[PDB]
Design a protein around this ligand. Sequence first.
Ligand code: GDP
Ligand code: GDP
Ligand code: MG
Ligand code: MG
Lengths: 395, 395
Amino acid sequence: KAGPVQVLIVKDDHSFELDETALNRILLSEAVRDKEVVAVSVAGAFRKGKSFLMDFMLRYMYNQESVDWVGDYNEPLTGFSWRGGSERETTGIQIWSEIFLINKPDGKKVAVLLMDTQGTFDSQSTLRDSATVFALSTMISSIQVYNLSQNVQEDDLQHLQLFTEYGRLAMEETFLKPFQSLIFLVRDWSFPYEFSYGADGGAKFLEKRLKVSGRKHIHSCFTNISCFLLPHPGLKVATNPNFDGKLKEIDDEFIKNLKILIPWLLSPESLDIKEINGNKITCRGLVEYFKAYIKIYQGEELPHPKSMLQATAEANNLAAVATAKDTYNKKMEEICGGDKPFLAPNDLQTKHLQLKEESVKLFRGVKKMGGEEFSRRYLQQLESEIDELYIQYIK
Amino acid sequence: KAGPVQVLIVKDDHSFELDETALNRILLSEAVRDKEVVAVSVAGAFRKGKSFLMDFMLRYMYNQESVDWVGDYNEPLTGFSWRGGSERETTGIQIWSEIFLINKPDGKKVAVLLMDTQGTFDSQSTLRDSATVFALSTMISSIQVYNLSQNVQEDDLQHLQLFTEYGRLAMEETFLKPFQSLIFLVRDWSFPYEFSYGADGGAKFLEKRLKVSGRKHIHSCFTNISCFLLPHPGLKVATNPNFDGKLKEIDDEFIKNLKILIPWLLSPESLDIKEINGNKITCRGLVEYFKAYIKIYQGEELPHPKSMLQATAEANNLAAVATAKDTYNKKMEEICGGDKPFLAPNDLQTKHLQLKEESVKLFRGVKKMGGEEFSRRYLQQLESEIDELYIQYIK
Ligand SMILES: Nc1nc2c(ncn2[C@@H]2O[C@H](COP(=O)(O)OP(=O)(O)O)[C@@H](O)[C@H]2O)c(=O)[nH]1
Ligand SMILES: Nc1nc2c(ncn2[C@@H]2O[C@H](COP(=O)(O)OP(=O)(O)O)[C@@H](O)[C@H]2O)c(=O)[nH]1
Ligand SMILES: [Mg+2]
Ligand SMILES: [Mg+2]
């Protein structure tokens, strides 16, 4: 009892495989199934310290009220763990097997769901998958902790909007925002002199970072958006898989901020209840929603992502292809359409071949991306097109 | 004397501003101007430890033959530095003011040019600029040290190919590879248990990393391609701008690898001479080439980069736009072209409006990215297009 449980997962064959029975044996029990739920997710790439963080989340949820829940400064990090043995990189969602019930300030009794959500981003291949998982994760989650490494890279925002897009695609679309809360968690922040560790520093840094979209429609998607800056834990944590050592051996700033961060996220008040279309949700509602969403993504198709490179080339060649088709069409009409139509089912061919060739030389001569085998496909397009402009011969 | 000198730089107004006179007062002196040159560049984003590394490059080039050039383990890092005061983030190229002359194994006397090359990548805006600078940097450089942070991110490769593309655009294109040497330098590698620190570990890691393009046409571009894995220097270095402390206070692995890395790159033998079109080049040749290249990029245009998001949406809507135009065209011909042509300059309109509307409802009903204001531009396209298919009325 009490361990991590795989609930969603993409397979090699890009097949999203949900585990409904395990999804049931934890969230559909008579004990939680009727309580309104708060689902906390920690989402990011593989090997970014998500499980390390989620362990401390446990340390707090299991010793919540009381103590140095963070633990004895001189004993090792003991207890329940999401870290398994030989870690395999996987795309999907894991949840913690034990739901927590705890008491809100307003006497409410509430079910607390932790999810690890993990994606890959190693190729146009795995991207689509990851975005789909992140999309799902976020639309069943009450708080998405987007766990990012040193900064907020163009990538990270790009990817964020993307999976944000995927979510709306599967959603009705009220006059409420689609999702609840987002938290940009920046790990191993190393510029406390520019922006300070924590939420204050986060806020500011995020501000300045977001003002670089010549937008923040991320704000259209989320009711609440915050940012926390977390320090490097130190080399012992950083370079040791399965860390093991005393609290002491972790950087002191790191732990001091962890201490504000976990309760910041998980303290009874800050605990925030999942909801959809303006309606607070119950563990069971969740499961059926999760199932609903997944059902969709399986039926109708998710737009394959087109990368910056592939796309920038496609635009490069097309511009040649069009520049060329242009100077052909213009010279042709100059002498073939309007008050000009002096007939002649030959010489029509002659000027055509004459011009078509000038365009081809025009195109082919242009410096362009991707090279021969790639551009040739566009040269062909250029050709079959001016031939369609060649049915500019009627009468 | 002996400091960093700005030689290229992009301004707010995206105007590449070369400093020819400073470019002359160092590389066109009678003393270096006729010696064959080896140009070492260290290229990457802002705040990635390039100057810190280049300092140690100096420590070696100035104490080359002899000593613990790395310096007294108990004294601070003293001497010449590329670190200025208040660091402003800039896109461009800086070179070290003093060229080094040194003796190759084969008695050759040779000029050594260090460049810092720095780009930004904060927006589709700044990307193009950075790629242009990186393109230039690489085509006047003898060795490009691509200085990357924790791993090799899809970004980093994407960006790499891109600026690689830009270089060819400005190059004649022999049957030789365009560029000489590339080195993937990975900073703060934290998985020595998966791949080891240094060149051995690098090689392997790069291998496995590159086999994720379902390509490595990076290999088409470069005669030699290697990878070195470098450890985190420690928190004192990491979190202190302008580091100052004793050698001792830097992580011992880091320095031990630095010690193999600098000579690996810069030792007299490993020193490799710049060349273009198969021809060894001289400082002066370089300067005129550098100038030649820059002249080009100013005249003819560099393809603006199209991002994954913008592009993936464009493909999403177009697919709707085409699916829709399809079921219109088909139903139309079913009753309007071929052996069917039963005339009727009305009802022609009726079925048309009838079908056009069915397509629009078909399109608009489809779930798609970017939302209203964005999709509307595609709805219009859908319309003016089936109206062009509406000149399917002739006779
Ligand atoms: N640099 C850094 N390393 C961490 C952090 N947290 C954990 N690590 C280490 O990074 C490695 C991967 O950690 P893990 O939590 O399994 O990453 P996950 O796959 O995202 O869950 C382990 O060696 C951890 O000890 C952090 O905040 N910063
Ligand atoms: N994490 C890490 N930090 C470094 C490294 N080298 C330097 N730093 C620190 O990172 C900050 C920026 O360094 P700097 O060399 O000016 O980066 P640059 O703008 O790319 O030249 C400073 O506080 C350095 O002390 C490294 O290899 N890893
Ligand atoms: Mg993990
Ligand atoms: Mg610098």
